[PDB]
């Protein structure tokens, strides 16, 4: 009944934010310049799973400005989650680069299986809140 593959969720690992930053899978306001990382946590139940790959499109007031893809790997069913991290980054600065981003996250593998495809918006402030 449940699957083998399940994202269970996304955070942004950010030590700054006053406050949590989850997406439970099962908007995103950051400060402009802060580090953060992606963290898409998930769960492999029962077969070994390969080429676990990290989709991410980016997209502003409608239109594309980004695509990125990450490699996860493969990993085998276990009863405790994984979390694939992104490399750290840099919140943009600068009010050209301040606003909401839409961000299209996919979580595939060899198979192409659609383990999971959501949608999620980042607002990037001169402040927190």
């Not at 991410?56 to 893809?69: E, M, P, S």
């Not at 299986?113 to 927190?128: A, G, V």
Request: aromatic content about 10%.
């Amino acid at each position: 009944m449940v699957p083998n593959v399940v994202v269970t969720g996304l955070t942004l690992v950010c030590s700054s934010a006053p406050g949590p930053l989850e997406l439970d899978l099962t908007s995103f306001v950051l400060k402009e310049g802060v580090e953060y990382r992606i963290a898409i946590s998930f769960r492999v139940n029962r077969e070994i799973v390969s080429g676990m790959k990290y989709i991410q499109h980016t997209y502003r007031k409608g239109v594309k400005i980004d695509k990125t893809d990450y490699m996860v790997g493969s990993y085998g069913p276990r009863a405790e989650e994984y979390e694939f991290l992104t490399p750290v980054e840099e919140a943009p600065k600068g009010m050209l680069a301040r606003g909401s981003y839409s961000i299209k996250s996919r979580f595939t593998d060899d198979d192409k299986t659609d383990h999971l495809s959501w949608e999620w918006n980042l607002t990037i402030k001169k402040d927190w809140k």
